[PDB]
């Protein structure tokens, strides 16, 4: 069970860190509208 | 109840909580008076 | 007793870790992907002066 | 202003009469909180606790 | 003199445009008190001028300057008074052997036995073997000359009163309310524009003390305690020790 | 004393009713705040005086 | 004397070839003692004079303040801890640190408070000494004298150069005595006035040789 | 010097605004120049080159040392069975019965003789400390402090704007680690516990478990 828990915490924190650092990687400039 | 030096003013107190419902209605009267410009 | 449990159902552990390797999972996966973002930060713009966001 | 407002609750519990402790020995009444918990492992343990 | 910044760069007297001229602070803000309703004799020429004269007691800049003679002395006595009332009560309440640090009973404490105790902090404590007859005698003499030295304008030639220059002469062309010659042992008056900003700090610290010594006398008459006793007991228990708990204390 | 507190509190209600109506009228009339400045200041300094009267009179009850 | 080549020296009469070339005698306290040659570069010799004089002015404040709490305890003033190397720990005492003996005085309880107040206060006035501050901006880095000579003693520059030598010679003695106080506390374990009282009591036995076998490694 | 914010006349200095003019030989040329030479020890521009190449070697050893002193005590707290997880007791692992086990594992390194450890170290350090002075297999003629080449395999020193920036990061990470390794020295002498134990003892009660708990500790008599 602990092998499953370590695996899920690698998996979930992989996708949560994709979420967080994705919006830190200049999301508001990824618009088609120019200023 | 209120302190007894103020209990004759208890009729005014029962009207006091509903007054901010009248403040959102007053914004509609003021905007009706300028004809919703 | 009869079986084997992890025994953390209502224990209130920090981020639900009870083996210390789970905390290093949290710091390893965050740290690996902070480092990929940090090295890749040279392609995101140098928003260095003060008026340099998406503003209105 | 929020920080000094949060110290009003601490001063009222530690110095200005105390606050109501429902877990007090002898039944719940007003208790001056002489020993507030400043341990960071206890205080920041609620925040990282599961919901 | 060259006055580098207290914390960082360049300091001194940054702007006196808050204290003099048409632009300056007032006793009411600009949406409640414009710049035409200022009285014509209150202009930005005196320190601490806020346009405050609702009761028309000022007439012209020469009557205002002779009330400025009254204001600045009343300031400078109340500032020595405010420190002379709080500090001996504060030392007595924290452990000094003053016996009469409360201000409104210091006189009756020394009537016939004498020996009003004196605490030369931090050098310890000294008894004072001067009788009440001498205190009446010395004070009227030693200060009747000083209040005549401000009328006559002529001090004694010899400088023995704690001087930092020792210039045994007289100086008669000095400014009334500001005799900056011998009365500046630390200097702090060479730059006249930071001197014009320190006299703003002088009258505001003065007006703050005149209100406070008035606050001393009233709240000692009401509460029956000195102001350090009123301060440490209101900080100990704010909602239960107010003006409003003191008044009407005879009923429960 | 109780009856002078209730008269002073009735007076506080009438002065507050004078401000709840009058002060928005004085503000949003054109050049009304310059003309009626000293009336509102006398209204506010009376209203503020009546609050501290009733609070001090509450100590005597 | 005290300046030029015809001045006092660190070996006295047996010092005519002992002193180096760069130690001319234009700075106060220059008896020509640079036996290890640390101050050969005049840029570093400028830095060491600042290091010497600030050390001198902290040791004179040190050697007077390590002594007057112990004299007044012999005169009957209770301090809690009057000996200087025990007087830091009296802030952990049950009534805190009263200044002489009066609880009406400072009455400090919190050591982290009086240290953080010190770091803010001493962090500013040691910064004022470097760049300048409210008492002056462009003065001498060692001898400001504008607000720091109120009594006018930095006048008559002939006798003012004498006061610089009287400053450093009082100061070098205090530095030599603070190095005293540190060692006469580690070795003896008692206060320096207590070190004075028993050497005046019996000069024969109460010297530093009675403590010479203290630091022997016995294993 | 470029417009790199850490170089030249308008650079950050060690007393912030209260520093005044820095010394004339600290022209903002070499990294970590906060203008702190109040003793004047580096007024000679040749000794100043030696002290620069002596600071950075101290910095690179203390950065390895501070990581090397936290890491066996951090894993030792997490159940790894070291003989002595604390760093200043980690030498005496060679003197216990089972010898010295890397990661507390008996079939890892399993050192038994301390004279074999020192005899290996003197031969291996003496070969490579001399390579740092001149020549060597990984690079023959290079810089004394920043040789690169085989010691920059990732190429992170190619852009000299980036390279002058990373040299500031190296010296500030190094001076922080030298200042902290000195903290490891003093707070092991004074307290007697590991620095992660001193940290967790401080976090459990910062009011009492500060350094003033041991202020009377070296009192004479
Ligand atoms: C000028 C300011 C001044 C003020 C506000 C007071 C205030 C007071 N004095 Mg007073 N005194 C003042 C000047 C002086 N007093 C005295 C000597 C005394 C005595 C001996 C007594 C007072 C007392 C009093 C009280 C009388 C009511 C009152 C608290 C009486 C008192 O303290 O009763 C409680 C009292 O017995 N004063 C001298 C020395 C000549 C003064 C010098 O100007
Ligand atoms: C040389 C004798 C002499 C003595 C002993 C005093 C004594 C005093 N004068 Mg006086 N004055 C003297 C000469 C003169 N005074 C003045 C005009 C003033 C004014 C305007 C004021 C004083 C004030 C004072 C008091 C505090 C001064 C101070 O800052 O103390 C610190 C240093 C010692 C003190 C009682 C002040 C005071 O307390 O009044 C409220 C004050 O405002 N004096 C003039 C010019 C007319 C003098 C002529 O030489
Ligand atoms: C303007 C405020 C300001 C102040 C006051 C300082 C002060 C300091 N900076 Mg600077 N800085 C400041 C702004 C800035 N600094 C820096 C960047 C740096 C760096 C990179 C460094 C400094 C360092 C220093 C120190 C240099 C000299 C020294 O060691 O003091 C000597 C005197 C003391 C430390 C006083 C002693 C403190 C305490 C009160 C004594 C405690 C007493 C003990 C109980 C006695 C012990 C008992 C005995 C028996 C063992 C000093 C603490 C250096 C440092 O940290 O070295 C330590 C350092 O490397 N600063 C920046 C970014 C540009 C600033 C921004 O404005
Ligand atoms: C980085 C260099 C280095 C340092 C600082 C130390 C430090 C130490 N070793 Mg050590 N070692 C070092 C390298 C080596 N050691 C060893 C093998 C051993 C063994 C077998 C043992 C030690 C032990 C010890 C400790 C002695 C306890 C003590 O004296 O408390 C007082 C000192 C402190 C608490 C720390 C203060 C450090 C030091 C005084 C300041 C550091 C600067 C130095 C003066 C520089 C010296 C290095 C020179 C040679 C370049 C001490 C912390 C013993 C031990 O673990 O006891 C518990 C022990 O049994 N070491 C080898 C393999 C040969 C080394 C290789 O270079
Ligand atoms: C021949 C093999 C050889 C070995 C085993 C070492 C070993 C070492 N050298 Mg060395 N060197 C060697 C050749 C040479 N070195 C140097 C010049 C230096 C310098 C200037 C430094 C080292 C340092 C080091 C250490 C860290 C290496 C590193 O930064 O990894 C990182 C890179 C890839 C993982 C390590 C002890 C560093 C040190 O001792 O600080 C603790 C250090 O500053 N070496 C030169 C001249 C170009 C060499 C020539 O062949
Ligand atoms: C039970 C325990 C559970 C776990 C704990 C859970 C709680 C954890 C909460 C901790 C707090 C998290 C907050 C992070 C904020 C990050 C915000 C950010 O986006 O931060 C952004 C900033 C950006 O910094 C700037 O980034 C810039 C980017 O430059 C690049 O680009 C520039 C042009 O843009 C130039 O070209 C330049 O040369 C080039 O380098 C510059 O380099 C600046 O120097 C630099 O200051 O990052 C920074 O400031 C530093 C960021 C903080 C440090 C991050 C450390 C991550 C973990 C490290 C440990 C990993 C362990 C691994 C273990 C391995 C083994 C398994
Ligand atoms: C968040 C609240 C806020 C803010 C940012 C401002 C900001 C300003 N006001 Mg407005 N004002 C406010 C609340 C506020 N006011 C309230 C509540 C009142 C009713 C009393 C007023 C009445 C008022 C008038 C009548 C005038 C201004 C004016 C001004 C301007 C500066 C002069 C000044 O200091 O005000 C003057 C107000 C005071 C001196 C009040 C005393 C405030 C001090 C700092 C004590 C504050 C105590 C505490 C920190 C806050 C309350 C604690 C808790 C109850 C929340 C400035 C733009 C002037 C202006 O715009 O000129 C054209 C002007 O004429 N204000
Ligand atoms: C729309 C908003 C909805 C309302 C939100 C209100 C706030 C809710 C969230 C705050 C409370 C939770 C705080 C953190 C708790 C925590 O660490 O959980 C820790 C828990 C603990 O997990 C369990 O803990 C137990 C011990 O108590 C045992 O150890 C169990 O074995 C273990 O599984 O983990 C979870 O429940 C799942 C968290 C992962 C999912 C997060 C999704 C994030 C999505 C992206 C976010 C980007 C930013
Ligand atoms: C700048 C200036 C200026 C002015 O003018 C003058 C003055 C003041 C003089 C100056 C200053 C200076 C300073 C600050 C110095 C300091 C230094 C240091 C601290 C170093 C360290 C340094 C430090 C170091 C190197 C360290 C290193 C370390 C190491 C390797 C470690 C090792 C180890 C480990 C891992 C673990 C094991 O178990 C053990 C051991 C073995 C132990
Ligand atoms: C405290 C107090 C007071 C005060 C009070 C107040 C503050 C009041 C206010 C009041 C108000 C402020 C009121 C208002 C009102 C309003 C209203 C009542 C309105 C209504 C309306 C309607 C009903 C309608 C609407 C509409 C329109 C017009 C448009 C849209 C649609 C519709 C139809 C919906 C007094 C002084 C008395 C004294 C006693 C106590
Ligand atoms: C927007 C700004 C809003 C700010 C509003 C702040 C409101 C705060 C409300 C708290 C008022 C409570 O105040 C109240 O405290 C104490 C508790 O009874 C009373 O004081 C006394 O009363 C009791 C016995 O008589 C005792 O238990 C108290 O120890 C004693 O201090 C005060 O007489 C009373 O005034």
From TrEMBL, chain E:
Transmembrane segments: none annotated. It comes from the Eukaryota. Chlorophyll a 14 binds at residues 204-205. Chlorophyll a 1 binds at residues 50-52, 58, 71, 202, 205, 207, 219, 234. Coiled coil: none annotated. It is found in: Plastid, Chloroplast thylakoid membrane. Chlorophyll a 9 binds at residue 147. Keywords: Chlorophyll, Chloroplast, Chromophore, Photosynthesis, Photosystem I, Photosystem II, Plastid, Thylakoid. Chlorophyll b 1 binds at residues 27, 76, 126, 147. Chlorophyll a 8 binds at residue 121. Gene3D superfamilies: Chlorophyll a/b binding protein domain. GO terms for molecular function: chlorophyll binding; mRNA binding; protein domain specific binding. Chlorophyll a 2 binds at residues 50, 52, 71, 207. GO terms for biological process: nonphotochemical quenching; photosynthesis, light harvesting in photosystem I; photosystem II assembly; response to light stimulus. Chlorophyll b 4 binds at residues 108, 221. One of its GO terms (cellular component) is photosystem II antenna complex. Chlorophyll a 10 binds at residues 147, 150. Chlorophyll b 2 binds at residues 27, 74. Chlorophyll a 11 binds at residues 180, 202. Chlorophyll a 7 binds at residue 121. Chlorophyll a 6 binds at residues 118-119. The keyword Ribosomal protein does not apply. Belongs to the light-harvesting chlorophyll a/b-binding (LHC) protein family. The light-harvesting complex (LHC) functions as a light receptor, it captures and delivers excitation energy to photosystems with which it is closely associated. This is Chlorophyll a-b binding protein, chloroplastic. The gene is lhcb5.
Automatic annotation (TrEMBL), chain G:
Chlorophyll b 10 binds at residues 55, 118, 126, 129. Chlorophyll b 2 binds at residues 10-11, 118. Keywords: Chlorophyll, Chloroplast, Chromophore, Magnesium, Membrane, Metal-binding, Photosynthesis, Photosystem I, Photosystem II, Plastid, Thylakoid, Transmembrane, Transmembrane helix. Chlorophyll a 13 binds at residue 170. Chlorophyll b 4 binds at residues 33, 118, 126, 129. Chlorophyll a 10 binds at residues 145, 167. Belongs to the light-harvesting chlorophyll a/b-binding (LHC) protein family. This is Chlorophyll a-b binding protein, chloroplastic. The lineage of its organism: Eukaryota, Viridiplantae, Chlorophyta, core chlorophytes, Chlorophyceae.
TrEMBL record, chain H:
Chlorophyll a 7 binds at residues 169, 173. Chlorophyll b 7 binds at residues 109, 112-113. One of its GO terms (molecular function) is metal ion binding. Chlorophyll a 4 binds at residue 58. It is a multi-pass membrane protein. Chlorophyll b 5 binds at residues 61, 121, 129, 132. The keyword Amino-acid biosynthesis does not apply. Chlorophyll b 1 binds at residues 14, 60, 109, 113, 129, 138, 218. Chlorophyll b 4 binds at residues 60, 138. It comes from the Eukaryota. One of its GO terms (cellular component) is photosystem I. Chlorophyll b 6 binds at residues 91-92, 121. Chlorophyll a 1 binds at residues 6, 36, 42, 55, 58, 93, 103, 169-170, 172-173, 175, 187, 202, 211. Chlorophyll a 3 binds at residues 34-36, 42, 55, 175. Chlorophyll a 9 binds at residue 202. Chlorophyll b 8 binds at residues 109, 113. One of its GO terms (biological process) is photosynthesis, light harvesting in photosystem I. Chlorophyll a 6 binds at residues 148, 170. InterPro entries: Chloro_AB-bd_pln, Chloroa_b-bind. Chlorophyll a 10 binds at residues 202, 210. Chlorophyll a 2 binds at residues 172-173. Chlorophyll a 5 binds at residues 93, 103. Belongs to the light-harvesting chlorophyll a/b-binding (LHC) protein family. The light-harvesting complex (LHC) functions as a light receptor, it captures and delivers excitation energy to photosystems with which it is closely associated. PANTHER family: CHLOROPHYLL A/B BINDING PROTEIN. This is Chlorophyll a-b binding protein, chloroplastic. It comes from Chlamydomonas reinhardtii. The gene is LhcII-4.
């Amino acid at each position: 069970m602990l092998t499953l828990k370590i695996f899920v915490y690698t998996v979930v924190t992989f996708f949560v860190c994709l979420f967080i650092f994705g919006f830190l990687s200049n999301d508001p400039a990824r618009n088609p509208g120019k200023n | 109840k209120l302190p007894e030096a103020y209990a004759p003013f208890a009729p005014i107190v029962d009207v006091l909580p509903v007054i901010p419902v009248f403040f959102i209605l007053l914004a509609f009267v003021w905007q009706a008076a300028v004809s919703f410009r | 007793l009869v079986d084997e449990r992890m025994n953390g159902d209502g224990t209130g552990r920090p981020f639900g870790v009870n083996d210390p390797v789970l905390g290093w999972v949290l710091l390893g996966v965050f740290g690996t992907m902070w480092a990929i973002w940090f090295i890749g930060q040279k392609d995101l713009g140098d928003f260095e002066d003060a008026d340099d966001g998406l503003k209105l | 202003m929020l920080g000094l407002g949060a110290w009003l609750l601490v001063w009222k519990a530690m110095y200005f009469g105390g606050v109501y402790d429902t877990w007090a020995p002898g039944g719940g009444d007003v208790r001056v909180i002489t020993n507030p918990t400043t341990n960071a492992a206890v205080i920041f343990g609620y925040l990282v606790k599961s919901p | 003199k060259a006055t580098r910044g207290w914390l960082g760069g360049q300091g001194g007297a940054a702007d006196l445009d808050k204290w003099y001229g048409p632009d300056r602070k007032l006793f009411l803000p600009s949406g409640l008190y414009d710049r035409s309703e200022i009285p014509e004799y209150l202009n930005g020429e005196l320190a601490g001028d806020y346009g405050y004269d609702p009761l028309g007691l000022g007439k012209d800049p020469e009557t205002v300057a002779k009330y400025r003679e009254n204001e600045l002395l009343h300031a400078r006595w109340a500032m020595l008074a405010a420190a002379g009332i709080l500090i001996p009560e504060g030392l007595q309440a924290n452990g000094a052997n003053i016996k009469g640090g409360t201000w409104f009973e210091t006189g009756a404490e020394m009537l016939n036995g004498g020996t009003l105790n004196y605490f030369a902090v931090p050098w310890g404590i000294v008894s004072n073997p001067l009788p009440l007859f001498a205190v009446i005698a010395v004070e009227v003499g030693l200060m009747g000359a000083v209040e005549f030295y401000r009328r006559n304008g002529t001090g004694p030639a010899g400088y023995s009163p704690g001087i930092g220059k020792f210039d045994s002469s007289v100086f008669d062309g000095l400014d009334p309310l500001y005799p900056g010659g011998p009365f500046d042992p630390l200097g702090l008056a060479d730059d006249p524009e930071v001197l014009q900003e320190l006299k703003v700090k002088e009258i505001k610290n003065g007006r703050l003390a005149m209100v406070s010594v008035l606050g001393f006398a009233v709240q000692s008459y009401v509460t029956g305690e000195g102001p350090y006793a009123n301060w440490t007991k209101h900080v100990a228990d704010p909602f239960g020790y107010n003006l409003l708990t003191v008044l009407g204390a005879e009923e429960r | 004393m109780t009856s002078i507190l209730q008269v002073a509190l009735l007076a506080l209600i009438f002065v507050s009713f004078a401000l709840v109506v009058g002060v928005p009228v004085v503000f949003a009339t054109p050049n009304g705040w310059t003309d009626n400045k000293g009336a509102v200041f006398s209204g506010l300094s009376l209203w503020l005086l009546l609050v501290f009267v009733v609070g001090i009179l509450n100590s005597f009850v | 004397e005290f300046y030029g080549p015809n001045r006092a020296k660190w070996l006295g009469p047996y010092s005519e070839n002992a002193t180096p070339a760069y130690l001319t005698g234009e700075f106060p306290g220059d008896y020509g003692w640079d036996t290890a040659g640390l101050s050969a570069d005049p840029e570093t010799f400028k830095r060491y004079r600042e290091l010497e004089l600030i050390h001198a002015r902290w040791a004179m404040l040190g050697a007077l303040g390590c002594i007057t709490p112990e004299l007044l305890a012999k005169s009957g003033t209770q301090f809690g801890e009057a000996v200087w190397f025990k007087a830091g720990a009296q802030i952990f005492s049950e009534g805190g640190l009263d200044y002489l003996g009066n609880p009406s005085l400072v009455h400090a309880q919190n050591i982290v408070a009086t240290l953080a107040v010190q770091v803010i206060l001493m962090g500013l006035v040691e910064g004022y000494r470097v760049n300048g501050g409210p008492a002056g901006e462009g003065l001498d880095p060692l001898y400001p004298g504008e607000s720091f000579d109120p009594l006018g003693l930095a006048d008559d520059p002939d006798t003012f150069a004498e006061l610089k030598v009287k400053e450093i010679k009082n100061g070098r003695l205090a530095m030599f005595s603070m190095f005293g106080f540190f060692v006469q506390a580690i070795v003896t374990g008692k206060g320096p006035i207590q070190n004075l009282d028993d050497h005046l009591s019996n000069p024969t036995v109460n010297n530093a040789f009675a403590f010479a076998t203290k630091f022997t490694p016995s294993a």
